[PDB]
């Protein structure tokens with residue numbers, strides 16, 4: 001009722017935006033998703049994503065996808081190693097905790113979410129450039145593509161979104177650490193020494209403020225990442241400059257780690273950043289609009305709370321908009337933002353605290 005004959009547009013077909021789209025569409029809501037990726041076959045780079053039971057899994061449950069998540073996700077243990085290649089601890093998943101926090105490849109999650117939507121709910125190859133209000137509808141401008149309108153816009157285009165001004169003037173800021181990620185295909189062949197060291201579990205190692213993390217089985221490929229405090233001699237279009245840089249930092253590390261670096265094809269550098277939730281968001285806005293996911297609360301990932309929190313937003317907002325407990329769309333948005341600020345600020349605190357704690361000189365897991 002609240003959203004009757006209201007054309008809702010979600011900006012961004014990431015895991016958060018898609019989940020939002022499903023929760024709305026399964027409630028008989030007219031919802032459109034705009035995604036800049038040219039087609040659905042576009043591969044999503046990055047590691048695996050873990051769904052927390054009180055948040056991520058609850059969102060999939062309400063979307064009717066919980067069993068699909070378990071069907072596709074893979075439970076994984078964790079090994080803590082040192083720079084010399086020794087396994088300090090073995091956290092081999094207990095059978096009884098096997099279905100607590102399994103790991104679903106990012107593309108798999110995109111696929112199940114898309115499959116839960118009606119055909120053509122997502123419009124590919126649509127990069128939103130500007131968002132300008134009218135007396136009654138939004139005007140959405142896409143780069144070299146026809147513009148569109150909407151009554152309510154939900155921003156979900158990531159932590160580096162540039163279309164936030166109408167909601168908040170808050171700016172993204174760097175937290176002081178840097179992450180270098182990569183994928184190795186057929187790791188058993190290219191990096192056998194380090195592959196066997198993982199031995200099915202995910203290796204986390206820290207020495208001299210340089211932390212290493214690895215998932216040996218991300219849909220057949222090994223995804224790993226290296227992080228450290230930041231501050232540039234490195235060009236990421238030049239894997240040679242990256243290797244020289246990493247081998248100097250990892251000179252103290254065992255050759256099996258050096259083998260991992262030497263075989264990596266493409267390096268991806270990213271500074272750790274946060275979209276702080278300190279100051280409240282704009283009070284009066286021209287038309288109904290809000291934000292969800294990383295666009296709302298980017299935070300360091302060292303606490304594994306990013307996607308889990310973003311899904312909480314999609315769950316709360318969609319619930320508020322369809323449970324008939326709010327007199328207006330604006331009030332329903334306000335309530336969501338009130339709730340989101342509370343637990344979202346907490347999540348940021350944990351991720352930053354864990355960040356500072358992990359890259360401290362005394363850290364030892």
Ligand SMILES: Cc1cc2nc3c(=O)[nH]c(=O)nc-3n(C[C@H](O)[C@H](O)[C@H](O)COP(=O)(O)OP(=O)(O)OC[C@H]3O[C@@H](n4cnc5c(N)ncnc54)[C@H](O)[C@@H]3O)c2cc1C
Pocket residue numbers: 011012013014015016017034035036037047048049050051126127128129156157158159179292293294295301304305306307308310
């Ligand atoms: C290195 C790293 C590791 C992480 N590890 C974990 C982990 O182990 N566990 C965990 O639970 N979480 C983890 N996270 C958090 C997780 O990645 C995010 O919280 C989650 O992906 C946010 O989803 P989202 O859709 O809100 O944003 P994103 O995932 O950034 O997706 C945004 C979407 O918007 C689209 N888009 C971009 N530009 C535009 C545009 N102009 N117009 C329209 N659409 C656009 C993008 O293509 C994409 O579809 C990690 C994050 C990082 C960076």
Ligand SMILES: Cc1c2c(c(O)c3c(OC(=O)c4ncccn4)cccc13)C(=O)[C@]1(O)C(=O)C(C(N)=O)=C(O)[C@@H](N(C)C)[C@@H]1C2
Pocket residue numbers: 047048050051052053101179181182202212213214215223224225226227301302303304305308
């Ligand atoms: C430190 C940390 C990492 C990861 C986590 O998932 C963590 C986590 O997640 C959960 O399991 C969980 N969440 C909520 C509820 C229950 N359980 C919880 C706590 C800490 C985690 C990664 O997966 C990681 O992405 C990873 O492996 C790689 C890589 N191999 O490339 C990265 O380099 C790292 N960073 C810096 C890019 C990441 C490290």
